[PDB]
Design a protein around this ligand. Sequence first.
Ligand SMILES: [Zn+2]
Ligand SMILES: [Zn+2]
Ligand SMILES: [Zn+2]
Length: 101
Amino acid sequence: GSSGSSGCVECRKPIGADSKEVHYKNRFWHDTCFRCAKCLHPLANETFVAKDNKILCNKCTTREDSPKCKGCFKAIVAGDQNVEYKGTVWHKDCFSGPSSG
Ligand SMILES: [Zn+2]
Ligand SMILES: [Zn+2]
Ligand SMILES: [Zn+2]
């Protein structure tokens, strides 16, 4: 504690006193840094939610997060062919089952 100056964890830059920052979970984000990770929306004037060490908004928190692949990381579709194993599902192709060599 030779200086002790609240800084940002996103831009790793120092925050000013006049600059409206957001202190949460022993952290601080700039009025332009503090925002969602899915829609990238600033929760400066809107509520926010922190889950699994990740910042998100109420609009996203809801069940509006379609399934995503792990082999290609592409938006998966119900009709489309996919392979579910442990929480995550890999496209029929991405998934290499032992069904054959
Ligand atoms: Zn920042
Ligand atoms: Zn969001
Ligand atoms: Zn895939």
